[PDB]
C-alpha cells in the first residue's frame, strides 16, 4: 500500500527526464538547487548525486516539525567525510545557529567511495545506529559520531556528554531490506531515513525502488512528500 | 589437490600473527609495504585491507610474464572508485609508463563500501566481465570500463576503440562460488583473479577460505605464489 503516481503525475515526471536546459532550475529550496541534470541521476539506474540526497534529507527535516513527528536535523552529505578526514575543528562551524541537542533525531548520510549509507542519532532512544543496504558494519562511524557529540557538547553547551545508556550499532543484513542494484544505494539511505523520521517500520524492498525513484522526482519537483 | 602448507610453513605463518611492532615491515615490493598490521587483516574473520589486495594483485602481475601465461596489468584498488566518482581525467595519469593495450588481461578490483568485487578485461576473449561473490550484478561497472578503454585509446594511441564483438557481463550466482562470510569477500576477489590469470576454471568454494588466508600470509611473506 503506497501512494499512487497518477497518469497526470507521471506526465510531470516524464517531462523532466526530457532533454533541454541542463541548468534549468527545477526546484530551489534550503540553499540548494535541483536542476534537470540533478534530477536525471534519479532516472533509470543512475547513481543519485549529493544534491538530490541533501535536498531530500532537507524535505524530511522540513516535514519533522509538523505536529506529532519527531524533530529532525539532517547533516549535509559532506559533513561526515569532512569530520572523518579532518576532525572536529573542520566541522565545528557547520553548526552555528544550530542546537543539535534540541532535536530528537540527527540524520548523517555517509559517503564511502561510490557507496551510500546512513547513520542516525536518536536522542529519545539514547542510541546511534548505522544502516547499510549492502549489510556492511561500521562500528567506527558510530564512535566517530559519539566522539563528535561529546566535542559538540563541550563546545556549544559547556558540558560533557552523558554516554550512560547510550548504545552504538549497525543494523544487520536480515534486519533491513538489502539492495540488488549498486546504484540504488542512495535511494535506500533516503528511504531508510523517510521511515525512521516518521517512526514507521522500514517496510519496503528492492522491488519498490523503480517506483521510489519516480516518486522522488515528483516529490522534489513539488517540495511535497507523499 | 591445492598445494599443501607444511608444518615448516605453518610455523612461518603462526609467527607473523604474533603481537609486536605493528609497523615492522614484513614485505616490501611493488612500491607497497606490508606491515604486521596489514597481515593481521588476513587472520580470523578479518576483512582484508587494500594493502593486502594490491600486494596480491601485483604478485599476479609479476607471475604473468612467466612464459605461457597471459600477460596481466592490475589496477590499484582506488582506481575504479576514483574513475567512477571523478571521471577519466582523475585517473588518466595513473597509466603514464603503462600501455594497457599491450597486455592480455586487465584486473580491476572494485570496492563498493565494505564489499569487494572484481572486473576483468580480457583482450583475447574481447570482453569485460564482473565477479561478485554475493552474486550482485553491475552492468554499469562494465560500461564505465568500456568508456575508460575508449578514453584511454583516444588519449594514449590517438585511435578510437573498436567495440565490435565486445561483450559486457556479470557472472551469475550459480556460475561462481558464493561467499558465506562477508569478511571473505576480498579473498574471493583475489582468488577469482588467481584462477583467471592462469586460465584455469574457478575451482574452489567458501570451505577453502581459511586455507586460502593462511596461504596468502605465507605467499606475501615470501613474495612467492604457490
Curated annotation (Swiss-Prot), chains A, B:
The compartments listed are: Nucleus; Cytoplasm
What positions carry the motif Nuclear export signal? 217-226
Q: Where is the active site?
A: 115, 132, 185 (nucleophile)
Tissues/organs with expression: Highly expressed in testis. Expressed at lower levels in thymus, pancreas, spleen, liver, ovary and small intestine.
The effect of residue 23 to A is: No effect on SUMO2 processing and SUMO2 deconjugating activities
Q: From the UniProt entry, list the residue stretches annotated as the region Protease.
A: 32-195
- Outcome of mutating residue 116 to A: Abolishes SUMO2 processing and SUMO2 deconjugating activities
Question: How the protein is affected by changing residue 114 to A?
Answer: No effect on SUMO2 processing and SUMO2 deconjugating activities
Q: What is the effect of changing residue 111 to A?
A: Impairs SUMO2 processing activity. No effect on SUMO2 deconjugating activity
Please indicate the residue ranges that the annotation assigns to the motif Nuclear localization signal.
156-159, 210-216
Subunit organization: Interacts with RBM33; promoting ALKBH5 desumoylation and subsequent activation.
Biological function: Protease that catalyzes two essential functions in the SUMO pathway. The first is the hydrolysis of an alpha-linked peptide bond at the C-terminal end of the small ubiquitin-like modifier (SUMO) propeptides, SUMO1, SUMO2 and SUMO3 leading to the mature form of the proteins. The second is the deconjugation of SUMO1, SUMO2 and SUMO3 from targeted proteins, by cleaving an epsilon-linked peptide bond between the C-terminal glycine of the mature SUMO and the lysine epsilon-amino group of the target protein. Deconjugates SUMO1 from HIPK2.
Into which family does the record put it?
A: Belongs to the peptidase C48 family.
Q: What is this protein called?
A: Sentrin-specific protease 1
